[PDB]
């Protein structure tokens, strides 16, 4: 898999 | 020494993936970007903590979402120029004094991961792309001097790359999990460079043909098992990170092995330490260095900041420094030194930005 948490 | 002594967040509450102070300055106060959002910002670092806001391109298309920028100098000029790109794919050279565009390349088949401009061609600038390669244009006379990619290119998005010290070679990494070479010092290379200046759209009927470089010099994917997101050159040295919370410095070959003897075909690498930290799953976070390369900076997902101490005999000797405050607890995608090592400064998911002084 993810770019963002 | 670094203490926290301001912060603040844009009011777009959009993620910030962006930040870089101005080194190409005289030295006139200390200035930096940050992108986020459809727009880039500058501000001016100032006494007593304060960050002075100054003026902000906003880009026409809503959808567009600008990822990365870098400086250089206008060699017309003498004065600062700024590239911004991101998910349109649009390389947009801005005029940082007044933020007007003053000219904008198109050509990536996706969106653009991370720019650098060259360490001592101040108009040679490196784009890498969603579209699996990179591009290196001269924005003096606006031409695309080479493509890099193909088969033997990346086979998935380009994430990061980074000009070794002389500007001889690139070292780029993505999504394919590779790492790969490119020599720019070739014979053909510096030629084509040399050309790349000569060419003047309004004195002749030719385009301007570029380089179609698909064949890196060295590849190796035995460094990291994921994304890999960021990478720089430590002399003949790489430090690389990706999504598994460690960042590793490696060379090609065996540990005698000179970087410039390396051949396409070298099977092997060797690890000369590696920095752990924690809480830094996600990709596209990036670690930052300060002029000198005696400090590296890298920033959490939770709003943790790593500083590491190069200044010793080995790269596993590193000395680290860990900073956090209270109210800082969004991820932190990209970190940026003052060129005077005094000032860190940190950009956060949440569009916040935290102000470190030494």
Same mark, same amino acid.
């Given at each position: 898999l993810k770019?963002?948490? | 020494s670094?203490?926290?002594?301001?912060s603040?967040?844009?009011?777009?509450?959009?993620?910030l993936?962006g930040?870089?102070?101005?080194?190409?300055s005289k030295?006139?106060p200390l200035?930096?970007?940050?992108?986020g959002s459809?727009?880039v910002?500058?501000?001016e670092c100032?006494s007593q903590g304060?960050i002075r806001?100054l003026?902000?391109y &906003?880009?026409?298309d809503?959808?567009?979402?600008?990822?990365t920028?870098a400086?250089?100098?206008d060699?017309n000029?003498? #004065?600062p120029?700024?590239a &911004?790109?991101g998910?349109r794919?649009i390389?947009?050279?801005?005029?940082?004094?007044?933020?007007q565009?003053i000219k904008?390349?198109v050509?990536?088949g996706?969106?653009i991961?991370?720019l650098?401009?060259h360490p001592?061609?101040?108009?040679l600038?490196?784009s890498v792309?969603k579209d699996?390669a990179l591009?290196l244009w001269?924005i003096?006379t =606006?031409?695309?001097?080479?493509i890099?990619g193909?088969v033997?290119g990346?086979?998935?998005?380009?994430?990061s790359?980074?000009?070794?010290?002389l500007g001889?070679?690139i070292m780029?990494?993505?999504?394919?999990?590779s790492?790969?070479?490119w020599?720019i010092?070739?014979?053909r290379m510096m030629n084509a460079?040399?050309?790349?200046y000569?060419y003047?759209?309004?004195?002749?009927?030719?385009?301007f043909?570029?380089?179609?470089?698909?064949?890196?010099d060295?590849?190796?994917?035995?460094?990291?098992?994921?994304?890999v997101?960021?990478v720089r050159?430590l002399?003949?040295?790489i430090?690389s990170?990706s999504c598994?919370?460690?960042i590793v410095?490696?060379?090609?070959?065996?540990?005698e092995?000179?970087i410039?003897?390396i051949k396409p075909?070298?099977?092997?690498?060797?690890?000369?330490?590696?920095f752990?930290?924690?809480?830094? =799953?996600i990709w596209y976070?990036?670690?930052?260095?300060?002029?000198?390369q005696?400090?590296?900076?890298?920033g959490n997902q939770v709003?943790?900041?790593?500083?590491?101490?190069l200044e010793?005999? =080995?790269?596993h000797?590193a000395?680290?420094?860990?900073l956090? #405050?209270?109210?800082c607890?969004?991820?932190?995608?990209?970190?940026?030194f003052?060129?005077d090592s005094?000032?860190?400064?940190?950009?956060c998911?949440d569009?916040?930005?935290?102000?470190?002084?030494?």
């Amino acid at each position: 898999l993810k770019k963002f948490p | 020494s670094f203490k926290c002594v301001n912060s603040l967040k844009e009011d777009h509450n959009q993620p910030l993936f962006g930040v870089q102070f101005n080194w190409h300055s005289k030295e006139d106060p200390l200035v930096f970007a940050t992108v986020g959002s459809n727009r880039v910002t500058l501000y001016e670092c100032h006494s007593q903590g304060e960050i002075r806001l100054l003026q902000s391109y &906003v880009d026409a298309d809503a959808d567009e979402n600008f990822y990365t920028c870098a400086w250089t100098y206008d060699s017309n000029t003498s #004065h600062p120029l700024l590239a &911004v790109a991101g998910s349109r794919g649009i390389i947009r050279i801005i005029n940082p004094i007044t933020m007007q565009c003053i000219k904008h390349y198109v050509g990536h088949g996706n969106a653009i991961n991370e720019l650098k401009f060259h360490p001592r061609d101040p108009n040679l600038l490196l784009s890498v792309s969603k579209d699996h390669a990179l591009r290196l244009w001269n924005i003096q006379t =606006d031409t695309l001097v080479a493509i890099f990619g193909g088969v033997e290119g990346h086979r998935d998005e380009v994430l990061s790359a980074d000009y070794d010290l002389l500007g001889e070679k690139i070292m780029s990494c993505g999504m394919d999990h590779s790492l790969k070479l490119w020599r720019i010092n070739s014979k053909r290379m510096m030629n084509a460079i040399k050309e790349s200046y000569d060419y003047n759209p309004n004195k002749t009927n030719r385009p301007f043909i570029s380089q179609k470089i698909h064949f890196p010099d060295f590849s190796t994917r035995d460094i990291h098992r994921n994304y890999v997101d960021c990478v720089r050159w430590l002399g003949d040295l790489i430090l690389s990170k990706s999504c598994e919370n460690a960042i590793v410095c490696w060379k090609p070959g065996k540990m005698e092995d000179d970087i410039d003897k390396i051949k396409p075909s070298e099977s092997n690498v060797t690890i000369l330490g590696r920095f752990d930290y924690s809480q830094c =799953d996600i990709w596209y976070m990036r670690f930052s260095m300060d002029f000198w390369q005696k400090m590296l900076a890298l920033g959490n997902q939770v709003g943790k900041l790593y500083v590491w101490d190069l200044e010793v005999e =080995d790269p596993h000797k590193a000395k680290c420094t860990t900073l956090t #405050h209270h109210k800082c607890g969004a991820a932190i995608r990209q970190t940026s030194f003052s060129r005077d090592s005094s000032i860190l400064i940190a950009v956060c998911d949440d569009a916040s930005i935290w102000r470190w002084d030494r």
